[PDB]
Design a protein around this ligand. Structure first.
Ligand SMILES: [Mg+2]
Ligand SMILES: [Mg+2]
Ligand SMILES: [Zn+2]
Ligand SMILES: [Zn+2]
Lengths: 270, 270
């Protein structure tokens, strides 16, 4: 049923993340982290993230089996890892994307006890995201409310890390490149779609956790509007038949991709 | 109904926290934080926490009104604030307690859209907790899964900050003092109840997010068992008629209080 499908979707998310962290711990040591300016405790927490994500994955496998389901296996991955900076970038990207993934999946999970367990893992990924934000100079808590995205939206965020999957996984939309990918309200973002999408009738969809989706004609640019807070997900949608894009992808034509809106807590002088 | 009651309970939690942060920002400046060894970005994030918690409170008020409810007003508070260290201690305490509060309340909230909003705020408080953990030398993500506590358990955690409430709020259990209040597996914790509770038949209840409640006869001491991860909540319960104490307080006789289990990511040399 939809509960099982939601859990298997989260297992796909956690297969990818756990695979990344397991491999990264094997390829990077505390000395590598210290050479990059980090502390022993930061490497230790990184190992803790690995351990926590192995648990998040293994818990989903167990629960799916207990419900009579068939747990998804891992896909084949590719991670753009060179130096410690790139490890932190991939980590931040994965953990930021966890929140909308879990929030979307929780809409479909039917029992109280199951929701409690899954919410309790979301809380953990949220703590991981705050850690990686802080280590990369971004506010660990850039806004009050994280919002959902759909399974296909999450596949779109993850697509550059997936070589192939041995089952029919949620299909991504074309990637939307954002330049720049961070900045304050009023930033004019140049948006480029990986596929030749006709922008006639397209709206920029700025998907926020606190204000929902804000939609505006592109300039192809999208402008960061006032009032939104937290991480933003920017997509192209065709028309406005869908007003709440975070819960309905039926008008999405490119993206979303993440945009790191400036916030109190970002690194600043002094 | 129970949804309204759960939201009003969370509004009590967020009245207390927002009141603390609003007052603390008025009494402490970035220069105070810098004199304590912190950075401008840490003060900025602290202001962001205030802003986020004002939003968490105000959102609950609005939602309760929209459901035809009567939002709880603030209680009268007392916060043990002297220096910056004490600000961070109170902050960490409040944010750590948010997670079980929201997780318990979510068991009672009936609609998909409401749960999405409330889960999205929990995600934010989880990020706040990770920030304050990191600033105080504790792992920002000490375990994989955060677990629930009941409304009365949350009142017990909060009781030292409440002078009075102008409505019948959830009643605390007697405070359980833990010495020490942090340490690794195997730590023997001396536990003292604020009221003269007879320990004949009492069990130590070690309430973990990953393994549930573990119960053992006291020594009055409780020993941290293997296998638990994350923040622990330690209570005295009478008998074992309740096995899952995080969702049923009907056997609780003292506590819980929090215990900061050592974890990868805690401050360590190098
Ligand atoms: Mg994660
Ligand atoms: Mg909070
Ligand atoms: Zn996870
Ligand atoms: Zn809050």
């Amino acid at each position: 049923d939809m509960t099982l499908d939601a859990l298997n979707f989260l297992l796909g998310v956690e297969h990818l993340a756990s695979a990344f962290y397991v491999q990264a711990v094997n390829n990077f040591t505390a000395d590598d982290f210290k050479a990059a300016g980090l502390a022993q405790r930061d490497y230790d927490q990184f190992v803790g993230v690995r351990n926590n994500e192995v648990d998040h994955r293994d818990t989903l496998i167990s629960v799916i089996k207990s419900l009579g389901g068939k747990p998804n296996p891992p896909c084949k991955y590719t991670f753009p890892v060179t130096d410690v900076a790139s490890v932190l970038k991939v980590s931040r990207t994965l953990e930021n994307a966890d929140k909308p993934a879990y929030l979307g999946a929780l809409r479909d999970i039917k029992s109280v006890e199951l929701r409690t367990s899954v919410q309790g893992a979301l809380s953990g990924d949220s703590a991981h995201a705050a850690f990686f934000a802080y280590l990369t100079g971004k506010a660990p808590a850039p806004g009050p409310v994280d919002g959902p995205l759909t399974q296909r939206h999450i596949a779109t965020l993850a697509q550059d890390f997936i070589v192939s999957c041995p089952y029919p996984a949620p299909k991504p939309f074309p990637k939307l490149t954002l330049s720049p990918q961070s900045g304050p309200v009023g930033t004019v973002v140049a948006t480029t779609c990986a596929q030749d999408v006709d922008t006639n009738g397209v709206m920029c969809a700025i998907i926020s956790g606190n204000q929902g989706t804000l939609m505006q004609r592109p300039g192809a640019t999208c402008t960061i509007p006032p009032g939104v807070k937290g991480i933003l997900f920017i997509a192209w949608v065709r028309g406005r038949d869908v007003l709440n894009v975070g819960v309905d992808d039926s008008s999405t034509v490119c993206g979303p991709n993440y945009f790191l809106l400036s916030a109190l807590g970002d690194a600043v002088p002094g």
